[PDB]
Design a protein around this ligand. Structure first.
Ligand SMILES: [Cl-]
Length: 175
């Protein structure tokens, strides 16, 4: 098990543009494209938003995909996004310290969070980050669950939290 396999499990793999729970158009292995209008929105705003997402994809891939890519392309974007998440951590003054204080398994859990909610979002878990740096695993676990993150994606959050708690890949084995 490793960060790529871990995120492949949590993000899945879809070769056609779809929208996630946060209402964002996405593709491949959790690659975010653009936000989507209201469910009522407007038949026009809809097509506009779809085209906006499609243009982002062509830009990312460098070709006219029409909203469809291949597995190789999905993995290409995935490699780029995993790298971007790590670099984001290293460049952030609040995240780097925590990341460096963690063992390799828990480092993957942090990358997972940043990959999903972005550098800025995770850097906001001030109290959780302090507990992790202090290696107060159980307290950090309880605190991490008190979040929109946990409430909106409980199954995934539980796997990530358990990883921070145990320092093992037990939550991802047998999946
Ligand atoms: Cl990109």
């Amino acid at each position: 098990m490793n960060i790529f396999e871990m995120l492949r499990i949590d993000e899945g793999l879809r070769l056609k543009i779809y929208k996630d729970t946060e209402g964002y158009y996405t593709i491949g292995i959790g690659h975010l494209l653009t936000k989507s209008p209201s469910i009522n929105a407007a038949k026009s705003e809809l097509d506009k938003a779809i085209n906006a997402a499609k243009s982002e994809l062509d830009k990312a891939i460098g070709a006219n995909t029409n909203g469809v890519i291949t597995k190789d392309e999905a993995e290409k974007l995935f490699n780029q996004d995993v790298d971007a998440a790590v670099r984001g951590i290293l460049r952030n003054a609040k995240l780097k310290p925590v990341y460096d204080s963690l063992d390799a398994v828990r480092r993957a859990a942090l990358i997972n969070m940043v990959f999903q909610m972005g550098e800025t979002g995770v850097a906001g878990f001030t109290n959780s980050l302090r507990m992790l740096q202090q290696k107060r695993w159980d307290e950090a676990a309880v605190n991490l669950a008190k979040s929109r993150w946990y409430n909106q994606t409980p199954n995934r959050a539980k796997r990530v939290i358990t990883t921070f708690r145990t320092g093992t890949w037990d939550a991802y084995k047998n999946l």
